[PDB]
Design a protein around this nucleic acid. Structure first.
Length: 69
DNA sequence: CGTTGCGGCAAAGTTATGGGTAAAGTCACACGTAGTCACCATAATGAAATAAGATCACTACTGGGCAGTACCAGACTCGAACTGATG
């Protein structure tokens, strides 16, 4: 899923990419890595991942190879 | 006896490695790197509201006393009269 918005990183971002994911494809990941953003340390994204049963994985700060691909 | 192959010995030959010295390269000085949302818990009021509390008003139930009435004598006081001593 690809999303484009003028705003800085904020949940809306996340609702969106995941909406399209669950829209044109069908479901959603199983383990979703996501750096140590704020959009990911928020309550909304974690609650949504819990609701849809996605294992949330977090790379350590300043390390980029963990999401290198 | 002479010749031929083989092996020890000791320079000599070839790589390698850590030093020194001039000399070809290399690259920044050219105004600039810090700067900006996103993030969710805690204090912190101010308002919203409380749940109980406070008082009014009415209804019914039950203690219960005061101004007044009434009798039966006992007892002190005194009009009115009786009666004796007297100067």
């Amino acid at each position: 899923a690809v999303y484009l918005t003028f705003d800085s990183p904020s949940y809306r971002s996340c609702l969106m990419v995941l909406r399209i994911c669950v829209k044109r494809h069908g479901r959603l990941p199983q383990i979703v890595v996501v750096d140590n953003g704020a959009e990911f340390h928020s309550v909304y994204f974690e609650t949504l991942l819990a609701t849809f049963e996605c294992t949330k994985k977090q790379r350590p700060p300043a390390k980029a190879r963990f999401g290198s691909v």
